[PDB]
Subunit: 255 residues, 5 copies
Amino acid sequence: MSLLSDLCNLNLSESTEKIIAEYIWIGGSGMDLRSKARTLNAPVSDPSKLPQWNYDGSSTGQAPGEDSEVILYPQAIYKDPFRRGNNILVMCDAYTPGGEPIPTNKRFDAAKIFSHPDVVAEEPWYGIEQEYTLLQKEVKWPIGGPYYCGAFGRDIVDAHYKACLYAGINISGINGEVMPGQWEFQVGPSVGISSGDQLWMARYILERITEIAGVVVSFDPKPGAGAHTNYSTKSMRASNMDPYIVTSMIANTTI
Amino acid sequence: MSLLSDLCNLNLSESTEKIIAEYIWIGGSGMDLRSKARTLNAPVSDPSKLPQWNYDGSSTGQAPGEDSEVILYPQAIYKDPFRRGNNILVMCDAYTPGGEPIPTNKRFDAAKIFSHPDVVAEEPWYGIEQEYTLLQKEVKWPIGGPYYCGAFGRDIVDAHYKACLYAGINISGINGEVMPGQWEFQVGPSVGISSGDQLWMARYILERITEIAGVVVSFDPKPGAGAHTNYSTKSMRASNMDPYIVTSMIANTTI
Amino acid sequence: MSLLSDLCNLNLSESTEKIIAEYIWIGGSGMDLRSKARTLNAPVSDPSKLPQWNYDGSSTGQAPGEDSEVILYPQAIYKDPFRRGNNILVMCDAYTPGGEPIPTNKRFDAAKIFSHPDVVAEEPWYGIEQEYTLLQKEVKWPIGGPYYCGAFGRDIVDAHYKACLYAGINISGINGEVMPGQWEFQVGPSVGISSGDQLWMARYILERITEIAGVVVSFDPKPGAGAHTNYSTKSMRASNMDPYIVTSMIANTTI
Amino acid sequence: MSLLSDLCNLNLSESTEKIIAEYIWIGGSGMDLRSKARTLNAPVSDPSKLPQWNYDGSSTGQAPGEDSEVILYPQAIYKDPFRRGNNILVMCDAYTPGGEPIPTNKRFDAAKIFSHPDVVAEEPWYGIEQEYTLLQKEVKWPIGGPYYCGAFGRDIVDAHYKACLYAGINISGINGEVMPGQWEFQVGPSVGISSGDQLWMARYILERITEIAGVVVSFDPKPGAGAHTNYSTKSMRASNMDPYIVTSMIANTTI
Amino acid sequence: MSLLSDLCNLNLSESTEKIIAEYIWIGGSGMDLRSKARTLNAPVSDPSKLPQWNYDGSSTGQAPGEDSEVILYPQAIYKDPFRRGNNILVMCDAYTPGGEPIPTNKRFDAAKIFSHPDVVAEEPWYGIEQEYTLLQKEVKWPIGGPYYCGAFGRDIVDAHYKACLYAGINISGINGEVMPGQWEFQVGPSVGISSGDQLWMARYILERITEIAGVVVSFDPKPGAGAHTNYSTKSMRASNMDPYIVTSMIANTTI
């Protein structure tokens, strides 16, 4: 009657060489996030050598009826916090076939903004601040002053923090809040496009951890959960809003 | 009081040398599968050295009442997910006595098709796609549009994926879809009769996963579901149907 | 809580040199087995060096009330698949005071039969098949035709099989059957009195695994189940009956 | 909760050098025991170096109101069941300050009896038989003919045996009886005052194991549970009564 | 639910060098205790290189509504029993901005008292005597004369002891009491301000252990529970009262 926990943790270096990999892309609605997996071969740490892939976009909800096929590309390579070992999560972005951004991409524009000379000569360290809430599934409300930096499912938050440490993303620090079940973590001085990458990946990791643990987070402005973006520069040195938009617009407007 | 999982997991290289082996043969209905186990002496990787063994055919149903004796042969030798250690599994095929195929064999015809000089020189690969739904025991209804890679019940599929990786199966990747609880995976470039072997072994492994967990899988097309074929060859390079037939009929017709 | 298995699964080489040893003898009805444990000093594989012991025969129910003293001899040197380590299980033979066999012994007669020059001349290897059923506490009925090699508490059976492999009993393979809950396993190569030894040890091990996992069994044919004998001789090379009677009558009559 | 067991099982030498030690003494009723803990600095096996300590005797009930102070001396150096590692237990005895034994001590008289030249030259060994019952917490009835060396909470007995084998109590075999829940165990060639020391230690370990598991023992003459003295000197070679009395009266009267 | 224990416990040296660190400060009410965390780069045992910090005083209840900033400093070097690894805890203290004491600071007074030339030459050791109670999470009453160490969740106390041993606290021994669920532990020789710091951090450790266990403690004078200090100086060498006050008032009055 065990929840298969004897499995799901097998060592792979003793049986085979193939390593699983999952492809995560932004969904059609702008906040939905969906993924499916494929095997791979001998591990490498260079995203350029990973093969491309596609999927059915109209089924997700970001591609037309006839042009469901929308290609994705590999650019970010990290570790896996739910199937340990050498398994890898890769943050792929949605594209209408032919190289042009999909209508709901908002990734190529950020790439060109942060690759523009006035920005790439600088170091747009965007320590964006993200905060959320952990309610439930059965009641969709938080468990149960002192709550700020306080005791409602702290194990979930500790698991998320340690999984983020393990994965390799740049996270800095967790913090509680007065409103029940509310926390926030800092990602520190990372590149704006990279900062959007880690924000999306960390939201996915949180969603998976909660669904494992028996709860669901609600990334909404009011469950208050929002976003604030700090800016660091070479000269200096909403809970569902797109991180690339806020990070890129600061780089575009300020520079 | 019910903790016996300390058993079922004992190391073998410290007490004895015997290694279990379970014989897997296709049942009478063509989709039902039966199996029983027997010891061995020493580890080996050559299927030709394994001894033969039989069973009572009329009890299973695919043999006559008086001719219940159904000789089986060893062809497949791969590890076991649910007993670990150094155990093996074999995908034996049903045969009438004297080397003649049983009425529900569908193994010798595909073997001779893929051993035909034209086909064997062709060396074709078949990434057969298989679709199914994991329903339940207590309700026998799917676990759970937006469901396409969107959630609950993923752990059974993760366990099955990792068990297939642990075994010798060549699997590719799970694709959650719109139908609740319904998932899917591709096999990949496997050589015909081999592709049928891995499809049957993977179906058995998933059946044991589900009966361990507490769910029941109905592979039938409409409990929709179907089967497709992939044809890659050196010249150019129903969800419950026999993999040998589809991979060989395209081998026979095209070649 | 209820976590006691940390103590149950301790190691002794880090603390002491004393090793437990459990003494098993045939009960009064001819099918019940009573036993307790006695400590020792150093491990050994020679049954002739073990100490002797005696119990209260009248309390058990196979000796006179006043002459309850029933000496027991050591026969078996095999490991314990419930406490592991260097723990051992030892056979015992009920005897009347003075070296004469107890009325319900049926062990010395088989010993002298298989020690006869004729029987030892034609080496009596005995493969014995034994059949049982899995009942339950609340119903005392099988868990839950097609059931032949199909699962009703397969974990109990896998545990028993692996424990038997660990504990030195020469078992050859389990075989699920048509009757719900009903299974059966073959013994294989075993020399007569030895065959009775492994049959009795395997029955005791199954009983203890059923009590550990919390489940009840009935080895009787109809709580139909039965047993057969095989005679592998050098010359040409009831589910609850005493193995010694069965394995020796064919040895005596044929040889 | 699934946690609290990793904490209880933390290794000691990884962080600090301090080792806990608990002080167990005979309570007011003569059968009850009381224990609280102190730290230490370095491991040692010589009882002559452990520091003295006292307590409040009026609260316990074996000291006068004004002279609640009751010094306790270090007696035994043996390990701990539930805090394994380098934790040790000491069997301290009650004493009115100034060297005068408490009326409920009954330990100094046995010391002087076994320290008398005739007895100490006799070297008397006492394999005392102790029998108890494992019923339950609340109902206080047995947990869960054939019962004599039988299936009523056997795990408790196995745990108690394996804990008693922690480099210490010279237990020499466990035993069951017809009375449900009833059990008993025997000690080896214990030297006089030791026999009482190990009997009290084993009773305390059994008490804590039962309270952890979920049962309560009831050491009463009629749960019938009693005791028997055994005498064996160099010349010749009640379930709740004080062991020191019985092991010394046979020492004093015979020698 | 069976998962998350593989989580919350991942190894860090395998993936990233970053180590989490949590900042605990005294709350506004005088007994509330709240904390947030942020990562670092490399381990160190020198409490002079860690970064600075601040938080929301008005939300917590310490600083005015407008000037809510409450600056904090690092001074403690310890470890975490709830996350293990190289994780550390620091006992920061509340200030008004600019280095001036906050109204509920009670740090500079004790620091100057113990660092006063006469006292620091004396360097008095304070074995504070702290006692508390473990009632319940839901009903806040114990789960259950003879109760004086003669149990109500002893596992919690054992866990707290071993956690305090791991965390580097100079603790010396535990004690029960007749009061239901009432315990206490001694810290023994500790240098002045370190006594108060260690009392506060041990209370925090116990608070998190009890909230993990599903049980709430009450640090109130009568659940009774108090605090008492010792004066073990080289010259002779309630449950919520501030340890610094009691340890420094005796330092100031006597010296």
